[PDB]
Amino acid sequence: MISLIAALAVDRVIGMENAMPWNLPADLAWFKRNTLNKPVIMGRHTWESIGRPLPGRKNIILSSQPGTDDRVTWVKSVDEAIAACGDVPEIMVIGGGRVYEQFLPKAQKLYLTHIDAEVEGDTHFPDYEPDDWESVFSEFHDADAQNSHSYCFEILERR
């Protein structure tokens, strides 16, 4: 199965991390947990923001342009990325904008972290119709000493 894991701001705004409101430690741990030991598919820029391959995980980069790092797998096609993951229980799509919008049609599960913070941004998350996504889990968390704004974890599944 294919899953997307994203962190969304107000108005479903998607964004490159490293800092911003997406460096939230507790969200990083939610990500690291759900993304541990599963093959990981990203974009160019989402790969640039990590700087290192995510360990114990095949890392796949969807890019129209050629590879610049042998520690990871570069592919050009959505279907090449899926195949490059082998036969695994769950594939994890990491971002960003263009990569989410390419993989939504084939995904069965969403791992959304809604953050209660606003960013002026022109990149958004794909508009999923609630008529084909069931909320299977939400976990609100207050603003914390390490977490600048509150945040709500959510899992959704296609019906």
97 makes contact with ligand D4C (CB under 6 A): no
51 has binding-site annotation = no
Q: Which of 15, 31, 62, 85 binds ligand D4C (CB under 6 A)?
A: 31
81 makes contact with ligand D4C (CB under 6 A): no
Establish whether the linkage from the previous residue to 96 is cis, with ω within 30° of 0. yes
DSSP of the chain = -EEEEEEE-GGGB----SSGGG--HHHHHHHHHHHTTS-EEEEHHHHHHH-SPPSSS-EEEE-SSPPS-TTSEEESSHHHHHHHT-S-S-EEEEE-HHHHHHHGGG-SEEEEEEES-----S-B-----GGGEEEEEEEEE---SS-SS-EEEEEEEE-
**Smallest distance from the beta carbon of 31 to ligand D4C, in angstroms?**
4
**Smallest distance from the beta carbon of 134 to ligand D4C, in angstroms?**
19
Q: Which is nearer to ligand D4C, 72 or 94 (CB)?
A: 94
Stretch that binds ligand D4C, among 43-51, 82-90, 130-138, 143-151 (CB under 6 A): 43-51
59 makes contact with ligand D4C (CB under 6 A): no
Q: Which of 2, 3, 5, 60 binds ligand D4C (CB under 6 A)?
A: 5
49 makes contact with ligand D4C (CB under 6 A): yes
27 makes contact with ligand D4C (CB under 6 A): yes
Q: Which is nearer to ligand D4C, 28 or 119 (CB)?
A: 28
- CA-nearest of 121, 155, 123, 150 to 138 is 155
Task: Give the number of C-alpha atoms closer than 13 A to the C-alpha of residue 7, restricted to the C-beta side.
Answer: 28
**Smallest distance from the beta carbon of 26 to ligand D4C, in angstroms?**
10
Binding site members for substrate: 5, 27, 52, 57, 113
